[PDB]
Every structure is written in C-alpha cells, then in structure tokens.
Design a protein around this ligand. Structure first.
Ligand SMILES: Nc1nc2c(ncn2[C@@H]2O[C@H](COP(=O)(O)OP(=O)(O)O[C@H]3O[C@H](CO)[C@@H](O)[C@H](O)[C@@H]3O)[C@@H](O)[C@H]2O)c(=O)[nH]1
Ligand SMILES: [Mn+2]
Ligand code: NA
Length: 507
C-alpha cells in the first residue's frame, strides 16, 4: 500500500519530538506516528529501494546509511565473558539448558524488511535471556544484581547492553563477579556485552538518554524473548518462574502494576489529547466510566484505563522487570519508541508507561499481572485507640499466592546522595541523627525484609515520607479496616536476609 506513503507530505518523518518544535496538533501528530507504523507492518503481509526510503522516514534512529555502505561497520558487536568478540553474528543458545551453542554470521536478506531481518537473520527464534541497560553509572547496581542471580543459581544467559558508554574497567569488574569462585551453590553466569552505537544514526544516537536506553537494551538484545531488568531490580524467584506466569504465556508480555500516586494527576487538557489519540488509533471512546468496562474485554486493562481517564492517574506500569516476545510484539515495541520521543513524552515519567501505551495504540493483545504493587521492609507498630506501617524506597511485586517475585529500589535504605538536603529538611532524620554524615551511613545501611503491605489506595494509599529525596513512601495496614499484610516465615526471612547480605557486600 505504497499509495498511503505517497499521499503523505514529501518531507514526512517519524522524528524525535523537541519542545522548541511548533506543535499546534499534538494528538494528530501522535496518531500519525502510530498509524504510519501500523500501515507498514500490515502492508508487509501483502521496489526494495522504496521500502528502505519508508524505513528511513519511519525509523530514522537506525543508521541505514552505514548498513548500505560498510555493512560490517553498521552491525552491533557482542562480547562474551571469556573475552571472545563477535561482529555481524547471531548468537544461538540451547532452549532447554540455556547454555551458548554457536554464532552463525548475519546474512541480511535484501528481499526482507530490516525488522523482519532482525527477527529471522539477526535473532535466534525462542532465545530467552536476562537483559540490563547499563552505563558506567550503573556498574555497582549491576554487580549486586549478578551476585543475587549467582546466589539463586541462575542458568539463563545475561546480556549487558550499552551505547559505547561502558568502560573496559567496568566490563572486567562485571566479568570478575560473574565468573570468579565458580561452584554448584554459586555458579558462574553466561554473561555477554552488546554495543548498539554502530546501529544508531549519529543524530539520534545521543537522544536515547537515561530510561530511554532501556529501549536500546530491549530492542537490540540477542534474545527474541528477553526478560529486561533494572540494575536496581532484585528477583527472589528463579527466572523460569517469570516466563511460567500465565500472563506472559497467553499474551507474550509480562507487565507489572506501579504505585498508585493520587498526588500527581493529569490536567483536563492532557486527558482530552490522550482521549483523541486513543480514539484516533483504535476507535475506543473514553467519554464516561460506564462504557470503558464495556469496550475493554480484560478487566485488569479496563481498571488501568479507568485509573487514567476517570481518576486522572499518571503511573500504571513499573518497567523494573519486563518480559516481551519480539516475535509477537516487535511492531508494538517500535510504537512504544515512537511515543517515547513524541509530543506526549512529557506526560509520563521515563519509559515504563509507553510499554502498555505502545501495545494499546498498536491494537496488539496485552495484559498486566493483576496483583497491585506493594511496600516491603520492617512492620513498624502504629499506636491507635494489628496496625502496621512500612516506609521504604523498595517497590515489591507478589504472586496471587502471596510469594515475593521481585522488587525495584535495591536493598539499601536509600540509593540517592541526598543526606545533606534530607537531614536539614526532614524532621524524623534531623532529630534521629546528629550530622548529615550519620544519615549518609543510615541511607547506605542494608534494609530488613520482615513483611509486605499491599495498600488499599481507596482508603489509605501510598504517602510520600519526603525521605530519600521524596523517593521514600509509607503504606499502612489495619486488620479488618484496609490493606493486605504478608508476614514472612523464619525460613523465608532467612533466605531474604541472605539475599540482602550478598547484595550489600561492600563491593
Ligand atoms: N544505559 C543506561 N541505562 C540507564 C540509564 N539510566 C537508567 N538506566 C536504566 O534504567 C533503569 C531504571 O532506572 P532507575 O533509577 O532504577 O529508575 P526507578 O527508580 O526504578 O524508576 C521507575 O521508573 C523508571 C522510568 O519509567 C523505570 O525505567 C524503572 O524501571 C522504574 O519503574 C536503570 O536501572 C538502568 O537499567 C542511563 O543513563 N544509561
Ligand atoms: Mn529501578
Ligand atoms: Na517475519
């Protein structure tokens, strides 16, 4: 359906939005970005140089110039823990034992599209692996994650993706903690490094910043079915348990729910623009709450849309742990990237919420894990006339049965370097300590995982304590009144205490 793209303005582009750019019609601009990508992957189901000209305007962040001229310079480079380097190569792994097999070279089929090439010629079908977006900044957090993966005896390969911003020193240190002291109880990890800098066109290569790097990590990872993790993420179950979750099995995405923040609400002008985008993309009308439940078959997804368009909430997905099957979700993911650098980029915090918005607006099947996000730490007694309170930076995620799956925020009190501000401005910290230096030591001290509270946001939700530079939140539980409590057994407390110990091990 070349006719569509010939009908567009000659200079048309899926460009990365800039605040300076004059945008009178943001809703229509977003609808165009989503539609142009939808039309593309639909007309591929139905002139090689014509296709490439559309690709260059749809995906300008790809360095198609280098692919066409000096193909070997364009392709990404993977580096194994052993020190072996692979150029323009496809990594293959054993689906059963997850161990590395071979690296067949990339034979780019000119008859197929770039993204079709990426799934068939560049990537091994069914390949599963842990993916982490890391610069030199994320070194320490990445080390601490590796230690925990080794402690729980992870067999899945790990790939650390960077944009030529991870030093040889950092990689050496990662390989050390990944491989050293190999044993059955603390096995070495099949770790890889991936530099995507060659794939990215120099104009857009620098535009992927902070959380946006996670799109580079996820998209270009050597696995078809990556499990993306924050460096500050901590899994408390074997990786296979995440893949086994029914939500991923049925949809091919594993998405977890975020904190409910009732402080930070959308303006009516913002919701009007979001309503136009949704209707413009998938013909869904979000005018009244009654007709939302009707038009959305999955009540878990309906609840998220109710929260956004009725209750005006901005935070829905936590991208600390994400599974995405690129075989079923690549076109959705590429829409997420378009939206990430769209006029509505400023509406949401980082990447997390563009995961599900990409799925929704692309009209691809998705869902969330239905369990609400939870707080984890010490069950402090609240004086009333069982009342418990947890105040932490840690955001936990439990299964239906109530087992801890994972958390984001690391396993120290506070990761932020805010002790100077926090000591002067927060009463509890100001009274409790004598200097800001004493607060620094408290912030660096390990956390103690004794229980979990799943707050009832309708009665007593998430309350910002102001501690750790307004990253610390308090959750309340009162028996038969509001919330759900989960007290860890001595067996569990011991396992968790061992995991916090290995995480906090002072480099
Ligand atoms: N390469 C690279 N990766 C980065 C960078 N900044 C962040 N990341 C990656 O993005 C992750 C998320 O950053 P956090 O600092 O852990 O954010 P958070 O407190 O967990 O915040 C929440 O919102 C983020 C933005 O939507 C989410 O990405 C995150 O998972 C979480 O839900 C990091 O762990 C790391 O893997 C960067 O400059 N470079
Ligand atoms: Mn995090
Ligand atoms: Na294909």
């Amino acid at each position: 359906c070349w006719s569509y793209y010939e009908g567009l303005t000659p200079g048309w582009l899926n460009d990365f939005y800039d605040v300076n750019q004059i945008t009178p019609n943001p809703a229509k601009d977003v609808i165009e970005l989503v539609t142009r990508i939808k039309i593309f992957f639909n007309c591929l189901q139905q002139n090689i140089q014509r296709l490439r000209d559309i690709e260059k305007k749809l995906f300008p962040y790809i360095n198609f110039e280098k692919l066409e001229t000096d193909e070997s310079a364009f392709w990404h480079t993977t580096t194994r823990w052993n020190g072996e380097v692979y150029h323009a190569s496809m990594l293959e792994f054993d689906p059963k034992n997850h161990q590395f097999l071979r690296s067949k070279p990339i034979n780019f089929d000119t008859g197929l599209s770039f993204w079709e090439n990426w799934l068939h010629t560049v990537t091994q079908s069914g390949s599963k692996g842990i993916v982490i977006s890391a610069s030199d900044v994320q070194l320490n957090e990445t080390i601490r994650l590796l230690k925990v993966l080794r402690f729980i005896k992870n067999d899945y390969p790990i790939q650390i993706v960077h944009n030529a911003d991870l030093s040889q020193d950092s990689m050496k240190s990662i390989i050390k903690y990944a491989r050293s002291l190999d044993t059955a109880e603390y096995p070495a990890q099949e770790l890889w490094f991936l530099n995507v800098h060659s794939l990215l066109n120099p104009k857009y290569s620098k535009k992927f910043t902070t959380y946006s790097n996670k799109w580079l990590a996820l998209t270009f990872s050597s696995f078809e079915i990556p499990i993306l993790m924050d460096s500050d993420t901590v899994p408390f179950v074997s990786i296979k348990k995440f893949y086994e979750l029914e939500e991923f099995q049925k949809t091919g995405v594993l998405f977890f729910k975020d904190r409910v923040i009732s402080d930070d609400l959308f303006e009516s002008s913002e919701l009007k623009i979001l309503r136009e985008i949704v209707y413009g993309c998938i013909g869904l009308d979000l005018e009244d709450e009654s007709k939302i439940h009707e038009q959305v078959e999955d009540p878990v997804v309906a609840q998220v849309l109710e929260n956004m368009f009725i209750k005006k909430y901005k935070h829905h997905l936590e991208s600390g742990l994400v599974i995405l099957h690129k075989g079923k979700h690549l076109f959705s993911m590429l829409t997420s990237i378009a939206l990430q650098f769209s006029p509505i980029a400023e509406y949401f915090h980082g990447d997390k919420d563009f995961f599900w918005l990409g799925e929704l607006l692309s009209n691809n099947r998705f869902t969330f894990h239905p369990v609400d996000a939870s707080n984890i730490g010490q069950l402090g007694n609240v004086v009333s006339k069982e009342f418990y309170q947890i105040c932490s930076v840690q955001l936990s995620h439990t299964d239906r049965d109530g087992s801890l799956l994972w958390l984001n925020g690391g396993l120290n009190i506070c990761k932020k370097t805010s002790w100077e501000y926090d000591y002067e401005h927060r009463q509890r910290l100001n009274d409790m300590f004598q200097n800001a230096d004493e607060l620094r030591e408290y912030y660096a001290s390990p956390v103690k995982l004794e229980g979990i509270i799943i707050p009832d946001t309708s009665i007593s939700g998430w309350i910002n304590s102001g501690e750790c530079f307004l990253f610390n939140y308090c959750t309340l539980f009162k028996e038969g009144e509001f919330g759900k409590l989960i007290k860890f057994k001595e067996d569990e407390k011991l396992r968790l205490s061992q995991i916090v110990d290995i995480w906090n091990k002072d480099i």
